[PDB]
Amino acid sequence: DQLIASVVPELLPSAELYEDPPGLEPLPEEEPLIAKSVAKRRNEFITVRYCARQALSVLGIPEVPILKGDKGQPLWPDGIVGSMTHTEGFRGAVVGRTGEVRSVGIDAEPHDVLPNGVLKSIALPVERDELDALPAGTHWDRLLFCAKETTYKAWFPLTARWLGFEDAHITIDPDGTFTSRILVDGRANDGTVLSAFDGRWIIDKGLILTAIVVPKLA
Ligand SMILES: [Mn+2]
């Protein structure tokens, strides 16, 4: 029934909460990151890390702070990859072991039309044509946006480089899959090359959730 579990493999534990339950707290090492933050930001940060620590516990990893790096990226324990996302109505996290997957990214968005002007900023001309050809009944613009954000989250842990919206062509299939084709140099930190990702998506509870797993090499 959970959205993330529906779009990632079983060997990546996930956890999600739709509200901020009363009484949660950051770990002491995390408090400085939100010390001067408004309540909505404090809450999404605290609740998502509760979810992340629940999922880490399934992998056998005990309570640990999840700090942020220079580009905002979550800093996981050695040997762990993961992703976190929050929007109104959703906090969720997924983690996995580097011996079992290379990278994971997720992103949750409300299932609504994009704000005025956003599609023109984030979509390639060809993508706009492709979305207009998809079947009526789904906010394909928001899905494309969500999928591109997930593409960056799966890419960054492997490359330590920026990926702009114009740097990848995402093709959405109505069947709950998508692909991301990288249009820039795909050199990865370990010397391999990234060229394309396979993604999964689900719409439920008024939300879009997209996920990419970069699988283990053969
Ligand atoms: Mn968020």
Ligand SMILES: [Mn+2]
């Ligand atoms: Mn998003």
